[PDB]
């Protein structure tokens, strides 16, 4: 049993860690271009915020599935019940 | 130490002589120009140019133009 439970602890760290790494870099790129556009055209700021959020919805789609499944593997375990 | 600077218009000159530093509102952000700067051609914004001269200071309003 202990190898399945121990490998599940690493699976959870791998699910959340890669999603944290990806979203932090993704928002550095997206938000960096929002500040660039806001600096050149300060009149466009109220419109651009809305457009940035559209992309943020696509950027967080898979990461939320990943952290949701990671929490599921800590409070429940579909592998431990299969041995 | 001192760079030659001339403010010129289609109708007449506005300023001339040597200067220490020039501050101009360029098309993509403001610029601080000093003696020895690299070749730059840039459209200016409607706004003022501040010319530092060996220490005294000069200011002139301009309505647009090209900074070479």
């Amino acid at each position: 049993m202990e190898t399945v439970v121990g490998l599940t602890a690493i699976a959870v760290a791998l699910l959340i860690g890669l999603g944290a790494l990806g979203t932090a870099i993704g928002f550095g790129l997206l938000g960096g271009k929002f500040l660039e556009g806001a600096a050149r055209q300060p009149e466009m700021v109220p419109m651009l915020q809305v457009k940035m959020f559209i992309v943020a919805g696509l950027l967080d789609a898979v990461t939320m599935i990943g952290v949701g499944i990671a929490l599921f593997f800590t409070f429940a375990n579909p592998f431990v019940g299969q041995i | 130490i001192t760079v030659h600077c001339d403010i010129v218009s289609a109708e007449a000159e506005i300023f001339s002589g040597l200067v220490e530093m020039v501050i101009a509102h360029g098309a993509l952000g403001d610029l601080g120009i000093a003696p020895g700067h690299a070749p730059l051609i840039t459209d200016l914004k409607p706004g003022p140019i501040r010319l530092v001269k060996q220490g005294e200071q000069e200011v002139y309003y301009i309505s647009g133009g090209f900074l070479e």
């Binding site: 915020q49 959020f53 939320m64 | -």
Partner: protein
């Protein structure tokens, strides 16, 4: 004694607990201290934190009392530079009229700076003098207050209470809950809005809870690493070897000079983030 024992001793606080023997009791070993519940207090951490707060208040109040109006006194000149620097930092970050942000920011900056300042003296000077004065050669004792997570958490939780209070005070309870559920995603129809309220809460609540947790750990990390790196450098001289001691003194000086940047930056950054976080509890960004 082994070096593992010296490091293990330095990494222990002076905990006070109600042991059955009598009304007042103190922990005598690391395990016995770890067995005490949350309802115990670190005598050393609190002692240094209240003392340095009173020392700062006393040197500032002695000057505030003798306000020359015109030309300032030698100490008053420094106090005014600090008041002007904080007022400038506040006016540049926050445009409201609340009188509580500037006194809070000055307190946060000068207090945290002094809590960190006691780390520059040799790490075992104070513990040895405290042990000799108390009459116990094996007393646990730590001078630097910010190397205890509990001290940094007390600062951030105190700031977070003010962030939630002002947000509710100006936006109203229904408005505050509204910002946590109606933004940033919104729609022209209720059938779509009900699908967006969990997404809005999932974004706002996570980004709200990260402020008090990051503030504490941001301050604790650099300082705890600073104290422990000084302890590791302190062990180098314990060998008695000439070339290894020569390396130790050179590393101690280089690390101490580098730490003059860290002590200043952590106090300044906690102040700026305090001002920034409070200023966004009086404004709206959707």
């Amino acid at each position: 004694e082994t070096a593992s024992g010296y490091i293990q001793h330095h990494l222990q606080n002076l905990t006070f607990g109600r042991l059955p023997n009598g009304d007042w009791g103190f922990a005598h070993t690391a395990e016995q201290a770890k067995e005490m519940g949350f309802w115990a207090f670190h005598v050393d951490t609190l002692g240094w934190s209240v003392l340095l707060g009173v020392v700062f208040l006393f040197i500032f109040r002695l000057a505030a009392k003798k306000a020359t109006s015109g030309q300032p006194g030698g100490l008053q000149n420094f106090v005014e530079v600090m008041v002007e620097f904080v007022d400038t930092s506040v006016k540049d970050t926050f445009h409201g009229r609340n009188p509580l942000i500037a006194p809070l920011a000055l307190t946060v900056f000068v207090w945290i700076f002094l809590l960190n300042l006691i780390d520059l003296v040799p790490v075992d000077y104070l513990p040895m003098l405290a042990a000799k004065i108390t009459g116990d050669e094996h007393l646990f004792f730590r001078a630097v207050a910010t190397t205890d997570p509990n001290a940094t958490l007390g600062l951030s939780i105190s700031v977070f209470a003010l962030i939630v209070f002002y947000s509710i005070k100006v936006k109203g309870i229904g408005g505050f809950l509204g910002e946590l559920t109606l933004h940033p995603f919104s729609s022209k129809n209720i059938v779509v809005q009900i699908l967006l309220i969990p997404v809005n809460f999932l974004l706002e609540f996570v980004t709200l809870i990260a402020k008090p947790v990051s503030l504490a750990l941001r301050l604790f990390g650099n300082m705890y690493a600073g104290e422990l790196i000084f302890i590791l450098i302190a062990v180098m001289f314990g060998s008695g070897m000439f070339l290894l001691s020569a390396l130790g003194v050179a590393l101690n000086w280089a690390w101490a000079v580098f730490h003059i940047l860290i002590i200043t930056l952590q106090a300044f950054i906690f102040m700026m983030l305090t001002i920034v976080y409070l200023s966004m509890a009086h404004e709206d960004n959707h």
